[PDB]
Design a protein around this nucleic acid. Structure first.
Ligand code: ADP
Ligand code: MG
Ligand code: ZN
Length: 660
RNA sequence: GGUACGUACC
RNA sequence: AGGUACGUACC
């Protein structure tokens, strides 16, 4: 096309075109990135005409956004005129970042790529003075100890150094924040809402926060807000699955004599039962910790029964005991593991297994939210010829299980729905992740039409370019005000709707209302900081900027501060001398006859390392320099000090540095 | 692995 | 403040 702005876009851009630092607040679908390109071209064109050094960096918080901002926005309008490049940690150039800065005029990258070069840690580096404009996308993250705020804390530091050089001149970049909502910072009052707006203004060094006002009617025509529903389920159904699981948990509690001060299937129970597992492992109480381990899995089944279907609660238990069968049973290619407690808990499950399995095949006692979800999907997918939608849910397991729920039900396939899950790429969950490539292909199929309905976690709410939806359902999920408006922003087709499906017992309905309340406070707070006089604004911004510098000085001073027993059976296994590190992350035992203390089972290599005497997971085997080496996960051991017994979730939590 | 942010519950 | 869990992300 040709690079022009709409009247509402020009109204918010104007201060940035005159060199002033600003935050631009534009809704989803408004074209915030197109404003960034117009400002980028305008900024550079002026620097050429004035015979000056022009250089722009566009910082993003996700890797796909580097590629996305190149194709859709920056390359089409700047590639023929200026040197443009996209860069991230995933892309492996054979060029140092300092050289990339020297050769290119527009740099789009993830923020940590800039921070890594500013910090150095390991070798003529980059400074913020090298850039004349810094654009921060999703600038509401310019907060607390996030990369955006560390970059901007360096900016504010050099700003104070520049005042000293006047008295005895290092140049400062222009700064442009881009967001839909700066948010409210979890405030429950208007004062704390306004404070949070001023903090974000202070962190980005904004002369003014900027919203569409004059051309507000035009903006309302461009983006249409969806219709709001709240579909509540009172849960007056009988729940024999809950009742029978509770009887099993009560049976297990009597055996070990561990009694809670909390309801079954609740979050305090989960905290209690995990705490009780940790204590029992430290105190060499195998009976107590094994029962607590099983009790947690039954507590998972209850809360699974609350959110998804009872077959998934059953399969959660059934797979756990299938995994126990594999580890505890003696196989070939080996060198009794079953206690009284192990046999007690196993027999208990097999006794109730018949009833639970067949009770789960009766859909009349299945979750009420599932039928509220069904009825919402059915009426909305028949409404339009070529529909599309997203179901937001909390857990990864619920995303997969809802996908199976839709697949094991041909009436959804009959009505035109073709579902697929969409989850995160991290490896800190008990459910397996989708890779960054698998995420990219599902969203490409979603826009193509091959996939019709995403069942997503918070992966789907911010940043990524997802096709306009006719429906977005928040299935029990209520997070913050920013995520709310972002979810509601995905619903921007003709006749689009936004629906909270939830139970009245969960309290998610009430938390949605507080986020609605907070969203209203945010617009009132933005209005007040804009109407604030310059003398009042500048004083308050300097206070926050000054105390933000002190905040990191405190956290800097905060951060400036044996044998291994098996957690289940307490057998002596390693000394502290035996452990060594590979790639400065994976810890490995190097005892000469370590092989005799563990067995191998399949589920850098998919082979578990389990205790010989009790079948407790210790970690996995790995190949490194052509040597089969045992990797020990710290979670599975009671570390014994000789001066006290403790358990750690990470190797970094130990006060011990290990060799190469 | 390391770190950050969000939510709920202590 | 810190802790537990879920979730997401970046290097
Ligand atoms: N001034 C403009 N003229 C023509 N097209 C525009 C203009 N501004 C934005 N667009 C188009 O609208 C789309 C903006 O959508 P999106 O990127 O979802 O906005 P946001 O990132 O603000 O949610 C882009 O694909 C762009 O081509
Ligand atoms: Mg955009
Ligand atoms: Zn053991």
């Amino acid at each position: 096309g040709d690079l022009t702005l709409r009247d509402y876009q020009m109204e918010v851009a104007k201060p940035a075109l005159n060199g002033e630092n600003i935050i631009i607040c534009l809704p989803t679908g408004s074209g915030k990135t197109r404003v960034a390109v117009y400002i980028t071209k305008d900024h550079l064109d002026k620097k050429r005409k004035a015979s000056e050094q022009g250089k722009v960096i566009v910082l993003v918080n996700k890797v796909p956004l580097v590629e996305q901002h190149l194709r859709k926005e920056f390359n089409p309008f700047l590639k023929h005129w200026y040197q443009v490049i996209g860069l991230s940690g995933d892309s492996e150039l054979k060029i140092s970042f300092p050289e990339v800065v020297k050769r290119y005029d527009v740099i789009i990258c993830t923020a940590q790529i800039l921070e890594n070069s500013l910090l150095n840690a390991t070798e003529e580096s980059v400074r913020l003075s090298d850039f004349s404009l810094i654009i921060i996308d999703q600038c509401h993250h310019t907060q607390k100890e996030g990369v955006y705020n560390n970059i901007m804390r360096r900016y504010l530091k050099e700003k104070i150094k520049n005042r000293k050089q006047a008295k005895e001149l290092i140049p400062q970049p222009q700064i442009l924040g881009l967001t839909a909502s700066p948010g409210v910072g979890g405030a429950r009052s208007n004062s704390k809402a306004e404070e949070h707006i001023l903090k974000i203004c202070a962190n980005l060094d904004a002369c003014r926060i900027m919203t569409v006002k004059e051309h507000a009617s035009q903006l309302k025509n461009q983006v249409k807000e969806p219709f709001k529903k709240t579909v509540i389920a009172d849960d007056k159904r009988r729940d024999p699955f809950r009742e029978r699981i509770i009887e099993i948990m009560q049976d297990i509690q009597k055996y070990c004599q561990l009694y809670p001060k909390s309801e079954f299937g609740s979050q305090p129970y989960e905290q209690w039962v995990i705490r009780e597992e940790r204590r029992a492992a430290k105190e060499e109480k195998r009976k107590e910790r094994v029962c607590a381990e099983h009790l947690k899995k039954y507590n998972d089944a209850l809360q699974i029964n609350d959110t998804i279907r009872m077959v998934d609660a059953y399969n959660h238990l059934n797979n756990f005991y299938k995994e126990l069968k594999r580890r505890k049973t003696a196989e070939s290619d080996d060198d009794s593991k079953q206690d009284e407690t192990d046999e007690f808990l196993m027999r208990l499950f097999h006794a109730k297994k018949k009833q639970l399995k067949e009770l789960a095949r009766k859909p009349e006692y299945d979750n009420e939210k599932l039928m509220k979800l069904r009825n919402t999907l059915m009426e909305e997918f028949t409404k339009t010829e070529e529909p599309r939608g997203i179901i937001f849910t909390k857990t990864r397991q619920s995303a997969l299980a809802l996908y199976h729920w839709i697949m094991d039900n041909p009436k959804f396939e009959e009505v035109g729905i073709k579902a697929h899950f969409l989850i995160g790429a991290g490896h800190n969950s008990e459910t397996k992740p989708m890779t960054q490539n698998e995420q990219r292909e599902v969203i490409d199929k979603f826009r193509g039409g091959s996939i019709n309905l995403l069942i997503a976690t918070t992966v789907a709410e911010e940043g990524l370019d997802i096709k306009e939806c006719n429906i977005v359902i928040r299935y029990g999920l209520v997070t913050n005000e920013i995520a709310m408006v972002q979810a509601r922003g995905r619903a921007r087709a003709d006749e689009s709707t936004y629906a909270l499906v939830a139970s009245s017992g969960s309290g998610a309905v009430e938390r949605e209302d507080v986020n609605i309340f907070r969203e209203n406070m945010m617009y009132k707070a933005i209005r007040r900081v804009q109407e604030m006089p310059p003398e009042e604004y500048l004083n308050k911004i300097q206070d926050f900027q000054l105390q933000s510098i002190v905040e990191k000085q405190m956290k800097a001073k905060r951060d400036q501060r044996i044998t291994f027993l098996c957690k289940n059976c307490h057998k002596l296994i390693c000394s502290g001398e035996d452990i060594q590190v590979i790639e400065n992350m994976h810890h490995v035992s190097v005892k000469k006859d370590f092989q005799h203390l563990y067995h191998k089972r399949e589920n850098q290599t998919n082979v578990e390392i389990i205790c010989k005497d009790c079948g407790q997971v210790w970690g996995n085997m790995m190949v490194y320099r052509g040597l089969d080496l045992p990797c020990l996960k710290i979670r599975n051991f009671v570390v014994a000090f000789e001066d006290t017994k403790e358990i750690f979730k990470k190797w970094g939590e130990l006060p011990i540095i290990f060799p190469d």
